[PDB]
Amino acid sequence: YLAVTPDYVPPLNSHAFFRELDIEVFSILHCGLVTKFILVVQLGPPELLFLLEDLSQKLESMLTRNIGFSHLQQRSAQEIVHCVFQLLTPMCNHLENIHNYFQCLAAKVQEYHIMSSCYQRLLQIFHGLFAWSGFSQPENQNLLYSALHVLSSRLKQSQPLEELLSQSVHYLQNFHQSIPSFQCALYLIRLLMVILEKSTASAQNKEKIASLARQFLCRVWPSNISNDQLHALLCIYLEHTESILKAIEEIAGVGVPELINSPKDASSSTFPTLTRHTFVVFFRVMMAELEK
Numbered sequence: 001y002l003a004v005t006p007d008y009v010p011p012l013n014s015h016a017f018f019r020e021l022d023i024e025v026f027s028i029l030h031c032g033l034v035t036k037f038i039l040v041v042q043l044g045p046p047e048l049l050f051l052l053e054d055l056s057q058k059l060e061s062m063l064t065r066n067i068g069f070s071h072l073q074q075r076s077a078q079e080i081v082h083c084v085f086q087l088l089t090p091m092c093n094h095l096e097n098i099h100n101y102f103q104c105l106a107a108k109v110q111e112y113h114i115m116s117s118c119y120q121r122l123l124q125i126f127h128g129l130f131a132w133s134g135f136s137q138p139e140n141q142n143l144l145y146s147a148l149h150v151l152s153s154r155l156k157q158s159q160p161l162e163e164l165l166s167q168s169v170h171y172l173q174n175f176h177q178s179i180p181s182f183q184c185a186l187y188l189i190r191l192l193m194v195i196l197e198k199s200t201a202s203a204q205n206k207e208k209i210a211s212l213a214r215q216f217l218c219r220v221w222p223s224n225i226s227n228d229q230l231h232a233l234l235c236i237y238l239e240h241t242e243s244i245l246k247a248i249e250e251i252a253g254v255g256v257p258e259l260i261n262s263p264k265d266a267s268s269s270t271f272p273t274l275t276r277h278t279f280v281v282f283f284r285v286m287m288a289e290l291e292k
Contacts, residue, residue: 015068
């Protein structure tokens, strides 16, 4: 009925007109997830997306106008992150289940889209949680340690802090294979960087960020990729690679020539994300990075 109704004003931008959900509503995320395809009353894929979308918007409003967030703003950011932290364990479980979901599609369509949105919402929540300016303060480092210990406990369980980061990154990096969309890959990449920021030694940390970034660039993403997101990924790959000059030489000296020889509606073999329509993004990043 919204489609047949262009002009109409709802009685008193969904958050502007819909009632705010309490922060305690997300406590029902402890329910498991079951899908109709390729896997009492239990949480469904559309219901999970509804809860994840609302939680992501709440985090984006404080950690990253007041209409639709009056009750949320009435609690300080310290409690909101702490409240989300209590959701970490049931929320990593949803990520693992969806990760196991996409792996089984190695060998209906609306279900795929809903789970894809759920995957991206989880990573955005995960990234927004750890990438909080409050973690720079020393008072809540214990809270950060507890969050990092949760991820490290998903594989094997007063450990040293650096061990938690290495384990947490290793646990999260395993999700790259299951990622179904470019936006999810960018969210995982950004999530890895903010965690690796806490680690002082980044000689190898830069390479694993760069190696993962190149793999996403070289992957054949099914078709959707926006130039803004592709621009963001190129900056991450170039700023983190060991030799930016050799990286630029490879894209411009190998990737671009084979793009020209390829058909008009085609892409580079080495860089499938490099087509005639996205060349400007590659060119703009390479020139800007070279100048920097």
